[PDB]
């Protein structure tokens, strides 16, 4: 769209994943007491922009779906993928969460959206793919959501 309607959505995308954080924030306390991923967690009401949060309770990712104010059905998702190092002192690879196990390190979140084909993340090494497909477009979406 326009210059001005990218704006707007760009900020509306961003108030979004702040409502999003509730659902990170859970996934990593999940993680620490070695419980479901989803544990206590349900999606906010919907908003004028924002549908659902929905939390996987056996991967933590999170999808975050945009209503059509924000963009079309189907081209509105980010995706958040939580990982974990393979050990907390020099870290040698990145691996998904595990339901069960007792996660005593930094949890780091990746943020993917349409066209984000690997992740970005650098050594200790890249970070898991999303499970479902984002399609936000990336130009809606904060540049570390990007390609």
């Given at each position: ?80 993928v939580?990982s ?10 990145r ?15 990746e943020?993917f959206?349409?066209?984000k084909?690997s992740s970005s993340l650098?050594?200790?090494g890249a970070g898991p793919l ?18």
């Amino acid at each position: 769209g326009s210059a001005y309607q990218d704006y707007l959505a760009r900020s509306r995308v961003g108030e979004g994943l702040a409502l999003a954080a509730s659902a990170r924030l859970a996934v990593a306390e999940n993680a620490a007491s070695g419980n479901g991923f989803s544990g206590g967690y349900v999606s906010p009401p919907a908003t004028r922009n924002v549908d659902s949060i929905r939390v996987d309770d056996d991967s933590g990712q999170i999808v975050v779906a945009f209503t059509t104010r924000v963009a079309a059905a189907g081209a509105n998702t980010l995706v958040l993928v939580p990982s974990a190092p393979d050990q907390a002192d020099t870290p040698t690879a990145r691996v998904a969460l595990s339901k069960g196990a007792v996660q005593a390190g930094a949890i780091t979140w990746e943020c993917f959206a349409d066209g984000k084909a690997s992740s970005s993340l650098p050594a200790p090494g890249a970070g898991p793919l999303p499970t479902d497909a984002p399609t936000l477009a990336g130009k809606l979406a904060p540049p570390e959501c990007r390609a």
